[PDB]
């Protein structure tokens, strides 16, 4: 049941929440009776609460908590339709949870894990409101986890360019999770490459993600597998990696070889499957305060599997090869989409010169990509790996993309080379000795893909 | 200090700045005393001036100069926060500068070069206002250099689809320049492919630039250099170019070979490094009024350098091969992001059939890319070249992108060919003569990159 349409013009809600004084206060009536103002010691409030509405326009008002009242949010929108905000002043929130837990930068990590499905933790919490829009307000003094929280099937939201870095952890906190739900929202690019960015779920549902990032690694499985294989669910050639090897040569359907690594801050050896590339390369006549960093965030998308022991490692190195930062990622960590695949976020620290990424084994044995990362193809039969690089500035150092030229036929249409038909061995009865180099050259051609 | 939030509704500011009559006017007081109205002969004004505000909404008003008053702009926003415009009528501006210089179509080039940092030259001038929104209003009769001007760290702006071609030079004039600033704005795509487009700085900061354009040339330096190299800071091969050569076959790190050319309208020879491709290919049963042009603008991004005689040349040719238009681009011209790289804009004239682009030398000697275009790798240690083609219509002729097919393994995962191990020379003592054709094929395989 609902009412539509509700119109709000230049309306201000200020200071509306349980405060320190109100919780301990007792109202004395004219009949000399005392009434306890609080319902409980964990009483929490809000400035504006909306539920069961449609076509609500809040045009140029103000939502702020002055006097530090215990608020779970400034505006709570639940089960509404087409809630649009037009330049509302938002400021001075006192972050709390629904059960009365104070949101503080000290315990900001336990709030995201234990209170993900809670209706709290942002200046504006949107729950089950399809047509949401915020339209670039000015926000400041936000003492909670994020600025906007989206959850419970908010699938067509649009978020404008408000003040990026005001909350404690994020700017946009997408908490939508359900396999049946298809979320596709629009986020301003300036909110992604800021000091506080968006979480991995918000980047999963960001439709204009190529406006701020680009793919630095794109690998998928082939259609027809090679000769020594019993399937075509993983790569069989290793041609996309600089170090490492394959798990098996008699069954290529087993993926890459996962070698043991004790922790993510340990050095990678040539036996591990990993790549390496440099960033932020500027000359000697440039000051490091003028030349900023290249990459701000790195988003990795991979297949999802319930069990693990196979880790996707990523490291940020500097000059002299010292590890500045690292992180593990188990197969069950990619659950933006629980059934198929998910996203993870990695923060590139300032001063990093090189980036390493690959697959390792967290247990003390040698595993394979199929059995120890994909769980034997139980949740997905097509492996893929996508790594997005969110640049600090749009195109300062040049975005990384595959080479192409409209005037060169090798890149415009591709090269005109085909696999040669199989040539039999040289067994002429006219001379020996030369059959040494001929059959070896014919064998090298067949072994390197040039010949069938 | 500031006031927030200021609300404007259906408010009109009409014909306010100093006029011809007012400048020469003298007020006669009741006490028979005379007061000169004009402070100086170069008095200038605007309809609305805003400074030090936050969360300002101008909802459906009108800003117009009637009676031709001397105005630097219609609205001047300076050091504000979240200024949003909602469908405001804007019209009839008389372009002037802050010092009283009239902005006409004759001096439109000297004003852009000499008054870049001036707070003037547009219908709406935005200076140091992060959250600016324009919401696409209807605009006409604009006698300034541009319609919107952005400068002084306006880093997150959205510009809607207003009337494109009303100003004299541009639609959006981005004047943001600073090494520490990170600008990321959103511009409506219909404002980029218009008669008047956006300047090179606005395309630099345009995050949704792939919605209106596509890369027709993308080239970067490799990681590991070739054998005679002394470093890997430039392309060591010439596979991206159809003409020209390398500077020296003994170093390969000096880059391409820059040959002398008198002017940009001179014909390019096979000794020059340049490419060529055709545009607007329609059949005989199509009328040229129905078949429009293919490319509207071309944006080139390259590394910055403070000196050098090497020039990036681009030419627009026709049938019979006559040069319609051309332009030089020195290394200092790529300074839209001063310390690293920059953008330039080239206007493709109507009737053009072919486009040529490459690198030449403006001085009468043969130079190299490392020394005569870059300053010895003093600013950027990685060379890149990205050329964007802004199409007249979105996909009329088909956008140029690398070939791909999801059903072909050669394009889905790549070809399964590797460099063969080095095969020694055939020196068998059993027969000669054939060893000539054997070692010549083995030498060619090693020379063509097929063999190590």
Numbering used by the authors:
A (entry chain A), B (entry chain B): 455 to 906
Sentences from the paper on this structure:
To bypass this protective barrier, some phages encode polysaccharide-degrading enzymes referred to as depolymerases to provide access to cell surface receptors. Here, we characterized the structure and enzymatic activity of DpK2, showing it to be a capsule-degrading hydrolase specific for K2-type polysaccharides. Based largely on homology modeling, but supported by recent structural analyses, depolymerase RBPs are modular, comprising three functional domains: an N-terminal domain that tethers it to the phage baseplate or to other elements of the tail, a central β-helical domain that contains the enzymatic activity of the protein, and a C-terminal domain which may either act as an autochaperone or, in some cases, form a noncatalytic carbohydrate binding module. While the archetypal siphoviruses such as Lambda, T1, T5, and Chi use “L-shaped” or fibrous appendages on their tails to bind cell surface features, phage RAD2 has globular appendages comprised of the depolymerase RBP DpK2.
To investigate the mechanism by which the RBP capsule depolymerase functions, DpK2 was purified as an enzymatically active trimer and its structure solved at a resolution of 2.7 Å. Initial reconstructions using C1 symmetry revealed an elongated molecule of approximately 180 Å (18 nm) in length, consistent with the dimensions of the tail appendages measured in the initial TEM micrographs of the RAD2 virion. Three discernible domains of DpK2 could be observed: an N-terminal domain containing an extended triple helical bundle, a central beta-helical domain, and a distinct C-terminal domain. C3 symmetry was used to further refine the structure of DpK2 to 2.7 Å resolution. Residues 191 to 906 of DpK2 could be modeled within the electron density. However, due to the applied C3 symmetry, high-resolution structural information of the N-terminal triple helical bundle was lost. The central domain (residues 317 to 642) is formed by three parallel right-handed β-helices consisting of 10 rungs, with each helix of the trimer being formed by an individual monomer. Analysis of the surface properties of DpK2 revealed a prominent negatively charged cavity (yellow oval) located within the central β-helical domain at the interface between neighboring monomers. Adjacent grooves (yellow lines) were observed emanating from the cavity, which may facilitate binding to or funneling of substrates toward the active site. This cavity consists of a negatively charged triad (D543, E545, and D546) and two dyads (D399-E423 and D619-E620) within close proximity, suggesting that DpK2 may function as a hydrolase.
